[PDB]
């Protein structure tokens, strides 16, 4: 099939754009096909992998958010090239590259801004995956602590974060990106 074989044109673009050598890309493709013989990873297949790694909670909500960022062309599947591009940024990117990737995750509706509700949505997704925790203080909930972090980053108090607000906000308070292991 087209999707199953690794074409030289794909390798050329990947070595131009990513931190991986041709040798590493070919190695990763062998592994990609062992887990995904079709060369196309579906959303549910993506969720299944996240369940292999967090068997206690429910990673479905978080995995679906991450999937949308991986699937950069929005065709409903992660092809090998999209897999490598995301892995390059998240495992080998510099701080600015990782913070932009985090911004794309938090900006669920892709409108150029993070809202409070979008920030809640990611945070809730993480707790579902990792283990929800009870709060007996209505003034010390995740939603409220997130509000404080958000307010500190929202320099012009318009109730939304630009990429610049989020990136310079995260370099003084990296907690929203360390929650994704991208600090």
Ligand X SMILES: O=C(CC(c1ccccc1)c1ccccc1)Nc1nc2ccccc2s1
Residues contributing to the site for Na ion (CB under 5 A): 68, 71, 74
Which tokens is 37 given?
Answer: 């013989």
Q: Would you count residue 156 as binding Ca ion (CB under 5 A)? A: yes
Q: Would you count residue 53 as binding ligand X (CB under 6 A)? A: yes
Q: Would you count residue 180 as binding ligand X (CB under 6 A)? A: yes
Span near ligand X by CB under 6 A; candidates 36-44, 83-91, 117-125, 159-167: 83-91
Cβ 143 to ligand X shortest distance, Å: 21
Which tokens is 152 given?
Answer: 């500190």
Among the listed residues 76, 59, 182, the one whose alpha carbon sits nearest the alpha carbon of residue 127: 59
Among 36, 46, 47, 71, binds Ca ion (CB under 5 A): 71
Does the annotation flag 165 for ligand binding? yes
Contacts 24+ apart (CB under 8 A), 69-77: 69/101, 69/104, 69/105, 70/46, 76/42, 76/43, 77/40, 77/41, 77/42
The contact set with ligand X (CB under 6 A) reads 49-50, 53, 66, 86-87, 90, 180-182
The contact set with Ca ion (CB under 5 A) reads 71, 73, 75, 77, 107, 109, 111, 113, 154, 156, 158
């Amino acid at each position: 099939k087209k999707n199953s074989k690794l074409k030289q044109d794909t390798i050329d673009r990947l070595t131009t754009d990513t931190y991986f050598t041709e040798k590493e890309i070919r190695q990763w493709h062998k592994g990609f096909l062992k887990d995904c013989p079709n060369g196309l990873l579906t959303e549910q297949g993506f969720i299944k992998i996240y369940k292999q790694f967090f068997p206690d909670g429910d990673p479905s909500k978080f995995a679906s958010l991450v999937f949308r960022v991986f699937d950069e062309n929005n065709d409903g599947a992660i092809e090998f090239e999209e897999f490598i591009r995301a892995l390059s940024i998240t495992s080998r990117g510099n701080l600015d590259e990782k913070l932009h990737w985090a911004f794309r995750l938090y900006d669920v509706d892709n409108d150029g801004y993070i809202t409070r509700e979008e920030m809640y949505n990611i945070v809730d997704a993480i707790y579902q995956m990792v283990g929800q925790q009870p709060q007996t203080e209505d003034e010390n909930t995740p939603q409220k602590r997130v509000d404080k972090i958000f307010d500190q980053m929202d320099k012009n108090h318009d109730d939304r974060l630009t990429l610049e607000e989020f990136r310079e906000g995260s370099k003084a308070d990296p907690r929203m990106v360390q929650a994704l292991s991208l600090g």
